[PDB]
Amino acid sequence: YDKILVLNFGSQYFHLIVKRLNNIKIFSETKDYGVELKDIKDMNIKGVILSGGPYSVTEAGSPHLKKEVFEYFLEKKIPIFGIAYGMQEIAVQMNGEVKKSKTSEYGATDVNILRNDNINNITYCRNFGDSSSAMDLYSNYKLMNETCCLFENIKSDITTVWMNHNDEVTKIPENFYLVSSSENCLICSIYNKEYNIYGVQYHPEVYESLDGELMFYNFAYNICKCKKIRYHELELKNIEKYKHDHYVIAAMSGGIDSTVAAAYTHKIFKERFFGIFIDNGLLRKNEAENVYTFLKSTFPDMNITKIDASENFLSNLQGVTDPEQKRKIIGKIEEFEKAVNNIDIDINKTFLLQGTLYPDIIESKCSKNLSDTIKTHHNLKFKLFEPFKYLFKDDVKTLSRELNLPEEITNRHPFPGPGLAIRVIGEINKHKLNILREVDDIFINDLKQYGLYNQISQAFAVLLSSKSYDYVCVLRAVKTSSFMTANWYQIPYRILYDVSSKPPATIEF
């Protein structure tokens, strides 16, 4: 049977967490924080938690996990979860800055920071530095846009959680993300999506508090499907499809998710699917003349003639920015029902693929995003293939897996679905970027060979030419696992990087 364990740092309360992880019939027991690797390498553990309290980070000798073991754990693709001091130090292994909080956090106090949408709400935001406008937090630090897969099926934004810590965590780690920000302690959690490194300064503990409790249930089960694993395979050998009434179909935008989903749908046979939208020079400019060749050639007998956009017209449309009509185009994923199918395959009986992930279809199922859009049209009007729900973002970046796919395609960063219709305002033309011959790919080309993809995750272009008030184009980069975090990174210290406080500019301002 499966098992979740503890690497305990300072747990005067750990039988409650064994009570938790075991309320859910999953196996849990105690081990020292200096427990041998050779022991834990044999067994079916896909979760490890850390527990601690008000132990000082300033004076070493306080509990600590070594490197080779950190590498060991990050390589096996097992997610990491720390509680207060455990997360205090998951932020030190990966970064590290904990100064002195004259105040404490004790007992159960209301914590209410959970989304990328928090200005006037917070009352304690003026607890330091005379913050007349609470966009400062949103600027210097940012949360995972994708609302709440954490705390699934509930959103009580008031989490009144047990704590007892005099010292406070003061800084954000890499792949910056911030799940909570309390009253006295305006930082209360930090979680990275792809590595799924959770960290929470609040201690659930005794039974008078709720929300905190179910977190461990959906924790155990949603980080890892233990008792019932199915991480690939299941819904694939699951396609009747009678006669030539229908075969599989693929939606594309240049996707790792679908670089191998191709194969999942393929089954060879000369072929059985078709591609949809994206020869766009916008997407990998070199692969516009070479996009459909490579999409035919990574697996040789593949096929390619997706009806596809190439860039974005200028003032054919609005010569201004209308928040409704700026970007609202999918631009290129279904979009058309008529002759998207090159054979008069049956109207609805024909199947479909999409590169939509459980973390990517969840923007869809949930609240439609304010700032950022990847790939819309996401069942209905077609045929339910249900491949979404299979695995996550890092899981499908690794979906290249044993397919041992070319690494220069993984060094290139993903592309959503709008193009430079997102955050490019109004008219424009040829003397302007339409084949994405600026920002993004620039970075990409020296992200591969100078050595920056290892640390930096993504980058894009933002052009602004509605009048000539002014017509600029401004650069910036993002270090994101989840779908939003774009803070200032130290590239070895009139295009602009990050002179502004991050907002009032966004990933796509």
Author numbering: 6 to 233, 238 to 341, 344 to 389, 397 to 486, 496 to 520, 539 to 554
Paper text:
GMP synthetase (EC 6.3.5.2) is a glutamine amidotransferase that catalyzes the final step of de novo GMP biosynthesis, whereby it converts xanthosine 5′-monophosphate (XMP) to guanosine 5′-monophosphate (GMP). GMPS is made up of two domains, one being a glutaminase (GATase) domain that catalyzes the hydrolysis of the amino acid glutamine to glutamate and ammonia. Functional GMPS dimers associate through the dimerization domain.
Here, we present novel findings that add further insight into the functioning of this enzyme with a structure of a variant in which not only the catalytic Cys89 was mutated, but also Cys113, which was earlier shown to form a disulfide bridge with Cys377 in the PfGMPS_C89A/Gln complex. The crystal structure of this mutant solved by molecular replacement was determined to a 2.8 Å resolution. If compared with the structure of the single mutant, the GATase domain is rotated by ~120° and translated ~4 Å, again when holding the ATPPase domain fixed. The monomeric nature of the double mutant in solution was confirmed by Small Angle X-ray Scattering studies, as opposed to the solution dimers observed earlier for the PfGMPSwt and PfGMPS_C89A enzymes and confirmed herein. Unequivocally, the double mutant is no longer able to form this disulfide bridge, resulting in an enzyme that, in principle, can continue its rotation. By all means, besides presenting an enzyme with a partly destroyed substrate binding pocket in the ATPPase domain, in PfGMPS_C89A_C113A, the interactions that are critical for ensuring correct ammonia channeling from the GATase domain to the ATPPase domain are modified. Hence, mutation of Cys113 to an alanine precludes the enzyme from resting in a conformation in which ammonia is in the correct position for attacking the AMP-XMP intermediate, as observed earlier in the 85° rotated enzyme.
